[PDB]
Design a binder for these strands. Structure first.
Length: 125
RNA sequence: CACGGGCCCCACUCCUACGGGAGGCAGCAGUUAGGAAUCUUCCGCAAUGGGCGCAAGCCUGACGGAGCGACGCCGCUUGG
């Protein structure tokens, strides 16, 4: 039982943001020559900067944000929706006037690599 | 139609501060090694040659040979 006549949601949206402190980046801009990079773990620390060379794309909804809309090619595909909400990662990058496909996720394509898949999305067929 | 210049693709010596790169020198030669075979990381850079600024001049692993080999053959000696 937790329903009567009171609006308590400043924990669900207050205490929620009581811990935040960030203006992400928020650029869905695809195909960038360089970007953010996780702090890694492994040894004691040895906080390295070479997670994944993303194209940057996506958004999400609150403390979750399926960030990665990248994967690669040496390993077929391979996405792994990382957590936008974290205090252990490099503070992003942004570049590219971007010919934007659909933004956010896609799932399709992602196998139609070949060659002409640089930073565009229209095609004649 | 680029000898070591480069772009692209595959095997891949090796280092990295994890983005990544400089990629084969069967040219004289070497190390190793496939193995019947093919010397030594050679000598002078006198002397032949190759390219130019007037030219000297430098560079030059081409050269004269050193030299690995009874490696094939030519000539000689192991007393009359």
């Amino acid at each position: 039982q937790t329903h009567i006549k009171i609006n308590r949601g400043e924990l669900l949206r207050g205490i929620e943001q009581d811990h935040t402190r960030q203006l992400p980046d928020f650029r869905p801009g695809d195909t960038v020559r360089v970007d953010t990079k996780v702090r890694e773990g492994n040894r004691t620390r040895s906080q390295a900067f070479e997670g994944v060379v993303i194209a940057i794309n996506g958004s999400g909804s609150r403390k979750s944000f399926t960030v990665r809309k990248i994967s690669f090619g040496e390993g077929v595909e391979r996405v792994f929706p990382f957590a936008s909400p974290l205090v252990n990662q490099v503070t992003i990058v942004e570049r590219g006037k971007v010919r934007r496909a659909k933004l956010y996720y896609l799932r399709e394509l992602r196998g139609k690599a070949a060659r002409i898949k640089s930073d565009r999305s229209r095609v004649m067929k």
